Symmetry: D2
Subunit: 135 residues, 4 copies
Amino acid sequence: MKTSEQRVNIATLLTENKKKIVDKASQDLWRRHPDLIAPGGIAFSQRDRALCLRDFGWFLHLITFCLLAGDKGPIESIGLISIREMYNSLGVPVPAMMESIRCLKEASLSLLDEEDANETAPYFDYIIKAMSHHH
Amino acid sequence: KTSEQRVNIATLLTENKKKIVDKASQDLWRRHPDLIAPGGIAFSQRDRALCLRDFGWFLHLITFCLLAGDKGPIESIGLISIREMYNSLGVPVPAMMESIRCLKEASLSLLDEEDANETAPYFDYIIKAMSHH
Amino acid sequence: TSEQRVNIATLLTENKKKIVDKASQDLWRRHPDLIAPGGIAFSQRDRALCLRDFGWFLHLITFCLLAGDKGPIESIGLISIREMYNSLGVPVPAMMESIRCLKEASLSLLDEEDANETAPYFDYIIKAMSH
Amino acid sequence: MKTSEQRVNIATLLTENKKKIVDKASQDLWRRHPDLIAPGGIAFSQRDRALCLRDFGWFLHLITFCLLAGDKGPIESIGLISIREMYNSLGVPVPAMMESIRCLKEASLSLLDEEDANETAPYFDYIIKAMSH
Ligand SMILES: [Cl-]
Ligand SMILES: [Cl-]
Ligand SMILES: [Cl-]
Ligand SMILES: [Cl-]
Ligand SMILES: [Cl-]
Ligand SMILES: [Cl-]
């Protein structure tokens, strides 16, 4: 394997448990802020909206792609700027995006062993910092 | 041999299950976000909020009643057992009633006027069953 | 029968996804051409089975379980369901096989006493979907 | 991509119709090779397996990420090589991966307007070439 085996394994494990991770994460946010995450009937492209499960899955895939790519900042990639821009135009609140990704972190890291969690936590942090304040 | 109208209405509701359940759940959620949670929740969990699975359960139930011609006033054995199931789940009565009201509006909006008039009683039957004592 | 039945129905309902995945995959391994991936318009005439058909039938068997309806008399609902699928042009052999797969998947999760209680309700629906 | 807004909109549109695209794509493959795509979920980590819906959604997100990033080769990104490697170890055939991505292409492009399809097609081609060694 050219690419890191650790990374490939972490990515396959996150991919395999996508549903479990997204349920745990969304439910965790919902318990605390029920008004920020709707159960269905929101179009991803709808301006000025609450979170939906699709945002949770988007971000999970994104963090996995970064993990595989070794991209964890400090330089924000072109892709990551375009994502921020996409969400910018969607009008999805910054505090809520940050909180969704924090919930995915806790959900994802709980499934990993300690060495893998330590390796993976920075990639969540990268994406949380990226999706923050205004720009 | 059995009502073609009813079979057609049931097919149409079954086909648009996702669309109906999204609309219905979102409708309830906009008004009472704390009563309907995202994603999968253990259906058997006592003292819980609603999940999408409850919306789909009830839709299938109303469809089965429609197919069976069962719209009260006498409550079937099945329907009493369903109420009982939910009774033990500790799911609030007002919230169950409201979930089924939202499915009604969502389902009837897809039907033409004659079919809506035919189908509305089956929702009312279930809404009344799930409001007990 | 009442509390046992309610509990079995709750348990089947709770494990709907797990049951439907197991059942569909079981059919698919043996007859891949009879069950397609993802969502298909339910009303589309002359189609393959989809996961939604598996979930429909599971809910149906659960309703029968709750109602105590296991034949020999076929309920009007059950005849109308057969009719619905009849017009959809889903093959009879494939429907029967889908329900057999749900049986095996559902019964494997139950303890032996509950499996014995529940098996007849699957058999009822399989016989019903066969004319 | 004419404007950066066009790209953002195409990415939003692909994301929004993920389910519709993945159903169409998987069904398209399935009609031709039913033994290569199983229904409703397989353990993603299982060695020597058939395709599942999760593979279709993975690749769609990947093509969207490339679209947003402006990455359409010819040079393969590190991430893209790692993805190929991931699948390599999963024992999923090269011909089947290529075919899945071709199906997503046709499914995704059919939902776009013709101008947007012309813009988007290169990103699919990039990923198809990448998944071929
Ligand atoms: Cl908080
Ligand atoms: Cl709200
Ligand atoms: Cl009236
Ligand atoms: Cl048709
Ligand atoms: Cl996916
Ligand atoms: Cl145009």
